Nucleic acid binder design. Sequence first.
DNA 1: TAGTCATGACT
DNA 2: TAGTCATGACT
DNA 3: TAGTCATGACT
DNA 4: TAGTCATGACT
Lengths: 286, 286, 285, 285
Amino acid sequence: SMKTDVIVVGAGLFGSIAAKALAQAGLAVVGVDDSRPGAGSLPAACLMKPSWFSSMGKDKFEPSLELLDRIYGVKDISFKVGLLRATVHWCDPAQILGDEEVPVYREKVTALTRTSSGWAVSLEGREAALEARSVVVAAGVWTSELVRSQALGGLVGRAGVAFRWQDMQLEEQFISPWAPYRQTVGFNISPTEVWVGDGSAIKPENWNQDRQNVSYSRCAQAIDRAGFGDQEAGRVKALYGIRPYIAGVPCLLEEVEPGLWALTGGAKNGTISAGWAASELVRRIK
Amino acid sequence: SMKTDVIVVGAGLFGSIAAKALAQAGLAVVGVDDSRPGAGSLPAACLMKPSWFSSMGKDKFEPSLELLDRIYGVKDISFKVGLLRATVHWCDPAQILGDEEVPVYREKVTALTRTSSGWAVSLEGREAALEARSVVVAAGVWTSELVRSQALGGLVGRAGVAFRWQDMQLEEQFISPWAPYRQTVGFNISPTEVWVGDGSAIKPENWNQDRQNVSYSRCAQAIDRAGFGDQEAGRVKALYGIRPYIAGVPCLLEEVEPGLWALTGGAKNGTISAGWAASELVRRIK
Amino acid sequence: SMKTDVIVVGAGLFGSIAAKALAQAGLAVVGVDDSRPGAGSLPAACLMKPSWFSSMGKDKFEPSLELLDRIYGVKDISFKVGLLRATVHWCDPAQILGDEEVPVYREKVTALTRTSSGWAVSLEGREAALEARSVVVAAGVWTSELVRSQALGGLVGRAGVAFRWQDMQLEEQFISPWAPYRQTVGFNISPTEVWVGDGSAIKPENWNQDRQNVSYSRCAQAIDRAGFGDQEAGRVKALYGIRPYIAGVPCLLEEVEPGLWALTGGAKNGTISAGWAASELVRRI
Amino acid sequence: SMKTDVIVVGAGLFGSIAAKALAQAGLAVVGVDDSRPGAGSLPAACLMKPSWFSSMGKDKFEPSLELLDRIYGVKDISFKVGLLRATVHWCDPAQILGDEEVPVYREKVTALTRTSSGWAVSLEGREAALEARSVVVAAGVWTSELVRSQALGGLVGRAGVAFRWQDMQLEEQFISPWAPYRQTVGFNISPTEVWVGDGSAIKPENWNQDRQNVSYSRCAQAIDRAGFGDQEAGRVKALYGIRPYIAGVPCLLEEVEPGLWALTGGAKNGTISAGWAASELVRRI
DNA sequence: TAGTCATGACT
DNA sequence: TAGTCATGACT
DNA sequence: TAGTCATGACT
DNA sequence: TAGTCATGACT
Ligand SMILES: Cc1cc2nc3c(=O)[nH]c(=O)nc-3n(C[C@H](O)[C@H](O)[C@H](O)COP(=O)(O)OP(=O)(O)OC[C@H]3O[C@@H](n4cnc5c(N)ncnc54)[C@H](O)[C@@H]3O)c2cc1C
Ligand SMILES: Cc1cc2nc3c(=O)[nH]c(=O)nc-3n(C[C@H](O)[C@H](O)[C@H](O)COP(=O)(O)OP(=O)(O)OC[C@H]3O[C@@H](n4cnc5c(N)ncnc54)[C@H](O)[C@@H]3O)c2cc1C
Ligand SMILES: Cc1cc2nc3c(=O)[nH]c(=O)nc-3n(C[C@H](O)[C@H](O)[C@H](O)COP(=O)(O)OP(=O)(O)OC[C@H]3O[C@@H](n4cnc5c(N)ncnc54)[C@H](O)[C@@H]3O)c2cc1C
Ligand SMILES: Cc1cc2nc3c(=O)[nH]c(=O)nc-3n(C[C@H](O)[C@H](O)[C@H](O)COP(=O)(O)OP(=O)(O)OC[C@H]3O[C@@H](n4cnc5c(N)ncnc54)[C@H](O)[C@@H]3O)c2cc1C
């Protein structure tokens, strides 16, 4: 058997950041993710704008930004917001979700049982189960499939799409508001790629290719690529993901049973919300 | 183990000056600085103008100038201010930040622990930790990451920029006022380089390349170099740095625990307040 | 110093129907109503279409129609419903709300107190209080202002309007559906008047003259009176009223405290529910 | 030698409503108000919009509206908001502040002394003092000059102005957004007067004639009267007032000493929060 | 005394 | 949210 | 299948 | 504060 300090279930932004924070504070951590489709972290750009996250309180952002700048590096980007300019914090999403410091098993967690020395995680098709003292369940919108709670009763999914163009760079990165609580954001996510999203947040059963095409046109029109059929040519990739939401939430970080944590509910401002949860977990586990 | 009389954390203006003042007082001193980007001392000119610093009081600027002249040499510069002339005190920043009398470990202080005698400076990646009877933390705007206090709760950063032209000298060194509390200052910092800065002090998150360009255009126009593309030609270097600022302080010099000092907040009038604090450390550390 | 068998608070359809039923069952009954505006019975047509009331069950609608036909008389009207025809039961609202067998005090009930003998109905501006062994509070959407049970906590109002044109008669009476659960109804409510309504049920606070005029024009178009400026001529009278509604209840008929009953929530299907609740009150009092 | 049940200091909205509520609950109440300028009730329109007051909770606003409609009458007004319509509750300010049921001494309360039977209210320039078992201080922004609790330590003023045009009526009453979270409100406060306000709430010491003219022009433009020179023609009256505000409190209703109450802090949602505090005072005195 | 720069509330 | 006021500090 | 209405969340 | 999105009961 595998016996470690911490097992993190889920390797999206929340499970990645929480595990690496624990590993970089000295703990032995192992991750498990079944790479299921629809994960909300795949389309993420990891943009963190003060205006979007200030509702948290200085008690929460600066703890988060220090963790991210220390562990990953927070680069600041200035976006064209109208004629004025606004600065947005950024972590490279490929850097967070690609970091390999914490080993990650590509298995599906089937059960979570407590033992004398702590918790035991069961995996489909494996009579063996992993074991650790502390377990973090950061399974996004699927967290209510492994952990139960009152807060976990409000867990719902709000899906969205982002588009990444290859071999392209924007001379001006922008945030263009088009509706209440909705803004089209375009920027260079890589030195060779452009990411655009309009903030659409819809229940996955109400999402469809036609509603996705409306968001493609809004995003494509904003970088003047509408009309060229870039999707069918393989020049743009459409990125779909389900964001976890629990009304009445920055996110849900609750010790459901002694030693078993649930981390989900990050909705829109997730990278910053994950840093807080990681700061709090390294504070409460170390 | 390393065991010394004094360990100074930080080798910007404050830690360089304090360490060297303490060494010249007979003490065995060692320094630790991780050369993280954005330090507020790198764009510094070390100009000390009485109209700017006399708010300090004769009780403080006079010991400060005596220390600085004894250790480094205070040269006087005659500046053109409009139709008048003003003399500004100066120390060569290359001489203060380059002095090698105090050896400096290029490491990151991770913790400061008390031991039976003295303090233990813990460093990333080193199972061994440094030790001295007294520790001075001159970590600028990061001082509150290692030391905690009531005063240190107001520690903030005020960023600014200066421009250093290569292979150039000014026939007239000048101070040209452009706004309340604001003046553009140009002079020869070296026999081959011209330094210009406008005094802009912004919260680092509100700084951007467009905000920097207003300060470049102001500074270039002051030496008739705007329009010639000196930046893209590599003829001028832009120097960005974060000043440590605390509302309500010449600077902050406080013994947080017996033998543990915090030294920061020297945003306004830094070299002169650093000379004062160093004069005080020489008197109060045995 | 007045002491009777039953005091019925509220003289709308439910309080009128229950009081008169109790009076004819032998009991000495008196009513109290402050004639406050917005009462839900004023626009009422007392139309009862089987399709609308069948959900309650024959165990309830059959007693109600028996009580109503005994006391008031139930008439059948044939309505044009599309290409088909349908029969609707009817009681004259002027006969139910105008009946004088039970006298009615025109005062506002301010409180309901228990006494050695029974319940005491306190009246605004009068130190004397009315007294009866039983009190039935049929106060429409205001019943929760005098009785404070749990069920009455969901009591809300669903407002609507009906229009009565004067000196007019319809050769064809109709139920013409225009949206899900919504139909415009025109018929002869009197031998000299036409009554029209579209079934709109809006929260009273979200009601306004623009929304009322949308219901007027829907109703005028249904009787070919749009274009004639009937409103500015004073040819049509607008009748606004708040229906009492409680989710999960034909209506609420509950003895909250001994001898103290709450009767409300009859939303749409009020006359048939009022006949039912009165049948039970005649049995239980 | 005046001795009553309750003495209410302050005759703006909070003391007016509380005094009249206590008087109608059987208590003998008198008021004292020195008619000092800058009171926050003079520019008041007594508009109560659910979107603004629901943060209070049904447990407070519904009791409050029941009291106001019982004592004064709550009218509903439909306002044009954008292309939509919204309902706002209303009480006539002339009815609340002009009611004469509770007599009001026009004197300045200079001190509050405890006596064996109750509290003694001293009046400037007057040797004798009034006395009552309970005293409510509803002194708006000056309440902390007579009661010195810790909560009253945050009592500050938020000034504003409203404009009443004479011999004018609006065909459409409106709430027009002019910035995020800022709206100009226009309506007919009387059958012969139009009231307009823009909701400006400023530290009283930063108010001046120039800043007032900015609100006059915003309000005049909103009713298409900019350019007619209504101010210098005497056709519009400017009404300046200080709202009492305490950060962290619907309003402050506290029994500071046995029988001595403080009632203030109703800057946002004043008439409705005064209705709530009055319901509680009738319950607790 | 002014312009610069920041912070907070938000019918 | 975003976007507009309001308020205050401060080579 | 559908059209109201109402009620709240919402970088 | 406005448009977008969800939910639920309904002559
Ligand atoms: C269009 C779009 C744009 C976005 N933009 C931004 C942005 O600008 N900035 C930002 O910070 N965030 C952004 N996000 C991210 C947003 O914050 C999401 O809420 C965030 O990705 C939540 O990630 P998570 O780790 O909570 O969930 P997920 O990424 O869904 O992680 C859950 C993981 O759990 C695994 N898992 C679940 N159940 C099991 C199981 N039983 N066994 C094993 N593994 C399991 C899944 O495989 C998955 O990898 C964006 C998202 C979208 C869709
Ligand atoms: C544009 C500009 C112009 C200026 N002009 C002048 C001028 O004309 N005259 C003047 O006197 N001053 C000037 N200054 C300087 C100003 O006074 C600054 O306040 C001063 O440099 C502050 O220096 P410091 O030593 O406190 O901070 P810093 O120089 O930032 O020193 C802090 C040091 O600590 C190190 N450090 C931090 N944390 C750790 C850790 N955990 N472990 C190890 N090392 C650590 C950092 O690497 C850094 O070197 C200017 C500054 C700027 C930006
Ligand atoms: C547009 C429209 C169309 C309708 N069509 C029909 C139809 O076709 N068929 C049908 O059967 N019904 C119809 N109705 C009526 C509907 O069924 C109502 O639900 C019914 O009228 C409810 O009546 P109620 O007696 O329960 O309430 P109300 O009629 O409101 O009676 C309550 C009475 O209590 C009084 N009251 C309240 N508080 C006090 C107090 N403190 N003191 C004294 N008195 C007090 C009020 O003055 C009022 O008179 C219609 C209603 C409307 C608005
Ligand atoms: C521009 C504007 C618009 C408004 N619009 C509305 C609206 O739409 N709806 C609404 O409900 N409200 C509105 N208000 C009112 C707001 O709610 C006020 O906060 C409210 O009027 C406060 O009432 P109060 O009774 O506490 O204070 P005030 O009316 O100020 O009453 C205090 C009274 O105390 C008296 N007093 C004080 N000290 C003494 C003393 N020592 N001796 C004797 N008398 C004394 C004063 O003379 C004064 O009469 C508005 C106000 C303004 C300025």
